[PDB]
Amino acid sequence: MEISQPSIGIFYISKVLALAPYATVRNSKGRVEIGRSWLFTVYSATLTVVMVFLTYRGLLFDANSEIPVRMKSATSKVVTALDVSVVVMAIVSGVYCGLFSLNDTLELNDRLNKIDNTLNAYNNFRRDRWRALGMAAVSLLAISILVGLDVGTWMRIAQDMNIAQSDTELNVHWYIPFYSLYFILTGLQVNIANTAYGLGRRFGRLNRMLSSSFLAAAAKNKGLLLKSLADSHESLGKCVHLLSNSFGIAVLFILVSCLLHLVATAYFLFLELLSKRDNGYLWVQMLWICFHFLRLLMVVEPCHLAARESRKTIQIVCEIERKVHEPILAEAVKKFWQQLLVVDADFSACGLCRVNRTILTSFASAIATYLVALIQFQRT
Amino acid sequence: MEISQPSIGIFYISKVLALAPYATVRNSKGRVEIGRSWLFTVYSATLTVVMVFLTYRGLLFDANSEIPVRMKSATSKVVTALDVSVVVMAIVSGVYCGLFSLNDTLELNDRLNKIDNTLNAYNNFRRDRWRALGMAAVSLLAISILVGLDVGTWMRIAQDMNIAQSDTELNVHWYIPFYSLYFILTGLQVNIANTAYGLGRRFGRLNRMLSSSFLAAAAKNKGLLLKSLADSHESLGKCVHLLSNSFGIAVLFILVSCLLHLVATAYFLFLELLSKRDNGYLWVQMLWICFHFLRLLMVVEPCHLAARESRKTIQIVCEIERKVHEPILAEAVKKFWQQLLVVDADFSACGLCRVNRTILTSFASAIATYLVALIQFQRT
Amino acid sequence: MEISQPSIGIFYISKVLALAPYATVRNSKGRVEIGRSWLFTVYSATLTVVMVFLTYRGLLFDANSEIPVRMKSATSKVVTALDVSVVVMAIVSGVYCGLFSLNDTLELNDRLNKIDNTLNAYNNFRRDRWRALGMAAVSLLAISILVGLDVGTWMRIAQDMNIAQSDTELNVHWYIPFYSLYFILTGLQVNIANTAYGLGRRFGRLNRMLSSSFLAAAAKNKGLLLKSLADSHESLGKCVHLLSNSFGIAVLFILVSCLLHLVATAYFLFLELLSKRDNGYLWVQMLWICFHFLRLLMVVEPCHLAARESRKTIQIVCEIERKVHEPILAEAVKKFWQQLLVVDADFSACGLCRVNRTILTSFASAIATYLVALIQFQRT
Amino acid sequence: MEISQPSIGIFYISKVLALAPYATVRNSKGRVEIGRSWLFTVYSATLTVVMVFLTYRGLLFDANSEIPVRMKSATSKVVTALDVSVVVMAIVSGVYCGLFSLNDTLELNDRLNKIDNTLNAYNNFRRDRWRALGMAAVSLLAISILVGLDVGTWMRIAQDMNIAQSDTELNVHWYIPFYSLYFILTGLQVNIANTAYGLGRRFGRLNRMLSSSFLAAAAKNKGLLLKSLADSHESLGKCVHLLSNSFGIAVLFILVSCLLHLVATAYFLFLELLSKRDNGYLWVQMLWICFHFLRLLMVVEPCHLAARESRKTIQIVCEIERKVHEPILAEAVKKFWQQLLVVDADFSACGLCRVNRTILTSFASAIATYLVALIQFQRT
Numbered sequence A, B, C, D: 001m002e003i004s005q006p007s008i009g010i011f012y013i014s015k016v017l018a019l020a021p022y023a024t025v026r027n028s029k030g031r032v033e034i035g036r037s038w039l040f041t042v043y044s045a046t047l048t049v050v051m052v053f054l055t056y057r058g059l060l061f062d063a064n065s066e067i068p069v070r071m072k073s074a075t076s077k078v079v080t081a082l083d084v085s086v087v088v089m090a091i092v093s094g095v096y097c098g099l100f101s102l103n104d105t106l107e108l109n110d111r112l113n114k115i116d117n118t119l120n121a122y123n124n125f126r127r128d129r130w131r132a133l134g135m136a137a138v139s140l141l142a143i144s145i146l147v148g149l150d151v152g153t154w155m156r157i158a159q160d161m162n163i164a165q166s167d168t169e170l171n172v173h174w175y176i177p178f179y180s181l182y183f184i185l186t187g188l189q190v191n192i193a194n195t196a197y198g199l200g201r202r203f204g205r206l207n208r209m210l211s212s213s214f215l216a217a218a219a220k221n222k223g224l225l226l227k228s229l230a231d232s233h234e235s236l237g238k239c240v241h242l243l244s245n246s247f248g249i250a251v252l253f254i255l256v257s258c259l260l261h262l263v264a265t266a267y268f269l270f271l272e273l274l275s276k277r278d279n280g281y282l283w284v285q286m287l288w289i290c291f292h293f294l295r296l297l298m299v300v301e302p303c304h305l306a307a308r309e310s311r312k313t314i315q316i317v318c319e320i321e322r323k324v325h326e327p328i329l330a331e332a333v334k335k336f337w338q339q340l341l342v343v344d345a346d347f348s349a350c351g352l353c354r355v356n357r358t359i360l361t362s363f364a365s366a367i368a369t370y371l372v373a374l375i376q377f378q379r380t
């Protein structure tokens, strides 16, 4: 996990959302020292357990109510239970990762500090801060608007089925913990995306420095710079591996949640399109599909960019080899090429899959198969 | 994108079809300088938007007509809408790529110029021009004949359902913009295929030169030639990567269109084969299947050939190593082997997939699954 | 197969379970010499044949009984027959592997002896013995408890269908050989897991020694130590390949059994959840799903860990290269890097698949497809 | 294609079966010179066309007969047509490959001659001849017995439906060309398997020679021997690539035929098992499944063995590196390691897939999916 001053707002958002139980103090040097915060550790654990319990309690209440609003049919019951469970598992994995990833966070931030010192020429505090805040604000505003639309639509739908001998609005009110879990999931995804995008951006800055200092006494300093760049590349690879070892289960459950959410939301949209009982419901389902696809991209594109930027450095190094003649600098470039030949760049989600754009294709296939089975199941 | 004098006809076809909004002037040296053409840029954008709007307007008109011709049943409505949407998305991606790929086009053509200068011994202006013109003419004639057959069949079918209180021929007439989109798609595919086939052909020429100059004072010139060949190979790899970064979204949507078109056309053929209402319709569907498969090959085989030709150069270089003894030439061959060891040759469609013949297999599986679900859906 | 003093209990369990027909004598040096035991060879073969015959005889008896308990419906008959056949094939493959893998076992144990001598600094006899005994005891206790629950549930179910003109409890009693096959399968899986986990643990110890002796006269001894570590790594790779060549068919049938068992047990759970005839049956099916998933992990995680630990040594060697300066030691490290560049670490199940965590994903897809077809089949 | 004296019987079988239209003359040196045989070329082409026409004519006759025997139901018609078409396409691809693969055959046999001269120490004329003749005889006897059983079963079935106003035995008699196509397919598969197994066996002999001459004045001769072994390895790789470029389409259609045949035969077996009209039909379907699986293995295992034997030579070369000290011999071993690092060993079926054991897994998945759809289709 990355905890830097430009992106400290994302850190605070994740902290209040039970995902970053760390206490950070900014040094007089501008560095952010990180340690365990037991108060926020127990707060995160308790909030996660309480909200999961409340979410499932509301689910059971809807299922056991006189007029269920969402959990009415066996198919609807199963789909809604799966939708709630994927969110619960994703947020629980994120909280667990944030609880037991302090050492990885410290190592990653130290490595990023040395890399930024090496790449001080391309650091943009203002631009990085604004990109981080914009991503966080856009994600939170999108989820807030979407939750408002969903709750309003479901309140209208529940009032449409309201019978004088029962209240169906409390059923919708009991689904608020699920939306809180959605907010926690959005914060976790924003944090992971910020970290992965920072890693990829640093890879790109390293490649730009390589191309600008080697393709655009003194040779000794140039070789020292190349050694520093190679060390930064190795440290960025290790930072990617740390992010993986820390949040791979979280990323895996996020991907599972995206897949199941897309399938379930498309199934609900198809049902409403056949029945055409409501149009606002249809548009809310389209917005949910867009949100799920956008967050799938949010979790996929960062790792793909990081791997792509790290795997394009070997070509630059080959160019330097072909253009370099100095003995010590040529030897340093040879060492760098050897180091890059065996670089493991792709992000691994607990070893189950390598997170890149190819996943999307696979996802589509699954979303093409299951959803179509599900549709066939409706007919049958 | 490749814009050369031998294939200038393909460039003009793509330009009038809203895909190559560039102004080209032939120098006294025979070189083709390329720049942005704002007139044709706005013409391409406006034509794309207008024809997409007209296509979807005709779709809605057919769906909302008294006697729909094509959009009659929910299954038929969905299938026809998907068929039209894949074409719309493919042509829109191609137009967008041609609009925002001027720098990549310039770089690719400069690189191809230097490569052709290096490979002047195997350049065949007449043969290249005739192959390009033959490909373009065959593609355009095939799509024209197929559109004529389809429109005649659909006119007959609409007249068969004609009731005195309505005209069903205007429904077919309103599907002409869709056929125009098909022409644009054919032009885009022809252009992409010409570029990729040129890259693969240059790879093959480079390999032939390697084998004829190294396996079939003076050693200094031979090493200079080997250095030029290595530079040409690296430039061809970068040209492949430029073509990818420029038209990968277009290739991806072309592949999606081919898959969905094959599935939908096979479904329609199976329906007509059960009902046997018309035989000309069945033969037109078979011709459509052939056309879609042929254009899938048109987009797949070029990249496969390019990768295959680029990946077989390392074996030739190993042979030279095993046969070369001169110091400087041996060092140059070692440098070339090192360069080839880390060559990224496969064509990437926006990172979603690597375009090669393996895709075909996968496609078949999908075409075996979805189509079979679709058939089962008819029964259900 | 690994036969060591710490894990000799697992060896005895596999021996009485017809999986390790070897006679072992402990030398005065603490080494375990292994040879063929013809008495136990014929005992294993005869027990396997007899128990397979009894299992299938009980299956036929249930199918041909007046009131079948498990083999009642065509779907139930097929599912139960597949469930029994996967277990039979898995245990038969394990027994055959143990019968015809004496040379591989001897080679593997010799190699492990030399490796342990090399890694004597990290050997923990007590911890290894306790981990092995704990794994064996947990597996055997889990399968025993699960068999008891299953047999009690099926006895209750059979008594519920009991008619005065027939006894349905003998039908359940005739399924005891199948549970014995389950015990044999558990023992085989425990043995394979112990061997693979030992290989991975030795890889980890080798990497720890590398990092502690090279990143934490004399240089000659250090280079000798590095040569010994490289030899140990190569021997561990060859031990992995021996385990593969010996028990790959067994691992493949174990994976097939896990897949089919998960599908069938989930199908039975879904049936009981629709009918809700019994709740103990549902909980027993959940326990069976947990057991099958846990043993799938038991067979998958060891190979994944071994490959992961073997593939992370090249980065350590690159670090030594970047930090080493001595001539002979630098040459030894270069030799080690060259050796690691071409290391085949992944475990192969008879060439059909590479056993790692990715399999899980694929399995899920299959378990998502077949089971869903099976559910659709119930409706149809 | 391999045409050697030990396997000349397989060559004659393929020649009379329209697959090897070559004239071979044995020199006084024992070498077999190969050339085009126009008589047998036209005989092969004419026989292929005539038998395909007769097969499809019998298919149409059965479909258009008063009482169809095999082509009765739409599902049965489609399945039988696909079964016949896969065989037709496989044999046509094999015949076309044999017609237009004379240059590849000559190159492959020259390379095999030089390799055998290099590996004269491990050549076993008697064993190779007997293995080739045994494979051919077993394949031909199996297909003959299976065709006899199938034709007898279908004659009985046709006589069971015989009505006094028509003859249903001529319908079975008109399916004899299909069995002739099966014989041609068996011969083609036997030839391809013999060639691929010879390549893999030569790879194994090369590895054995490496291990026996380097791990079990004079050093100059040893380095000469190593150079010859490296040349033999490169020639064997090129022979594999020649076999691919010559018969990849044939292998691809053989694999497609195996897949479709397994699916169709299992579907027919399931139908007969539900109806239980005949038991001999069921056993014949089981025998057909066994035959199709065995020929799938016949086409898969050879390439897998070749790749496995070629990919295990680099480890032996690393061992020699680690054990070799002589300057010239060490340099030769380094050259060999460099050559092996970039070896393309896997067999490619026209670029669609790499033929190895992994295919089997994929096949199973397909055979698990389609067949299950097909079963569901019966219910629907």
Ligand SMILES: OC[C@H]1O[C@](O)(CO)[C@@H](O)[C@@H]1O
Binding pocket: A083, A150, A261, A264, A265, A268, A285, A288, A289
């Ligand atoms: O299921 C349709 C949509 O409704 C939600 O459950 C929100 O309450 C989402 O998980 C899903 O996208």
Ligand SMILES: OC[C@H]1O[C@](O)(CO)[C@@H](O)[C@@H]1O
Binding pocket: B083, B150, B261, B264, B265, B268, B285, B288, B289
């Ligand atoms: O759908 C069947 C065929 O008809 C078309 O729509 C042409 O109008 C094609 O897209 C398709 O191949």
Ligand SMILES: OC[C@H]1O[C@](O)(CO)[C@@H](O)[C@@H]1O
Binding pocket: C083, C150, C261, C264, C265, C268, C285, C288, C289
């Ligand atoms: O089929 C449901 C369960 O019952 C068993 O057959 C045990 O008798 C298991 O193989 C399976 O997990």
Ligand SMILES: OC[C@H]1O[C@](O)(CO)[C@@H](O)[C@@H]1O
Binding pocket: D083, D150, D261, D264, D265, D268, D285, D288, D289
């Ligand atoms: O279809 C069942 C079997 O019958 C055959 O057609 C033989 O006539 C085979 O192709 C198939 O294995």
Ligand code: NA
Binding pocket: A376, B376, C376, D376
């Ligand atoms: Na179905």
Ligand code: NA
Binding pocket: A369, B369, C369, D369
């Ligand atoms: Na599928």
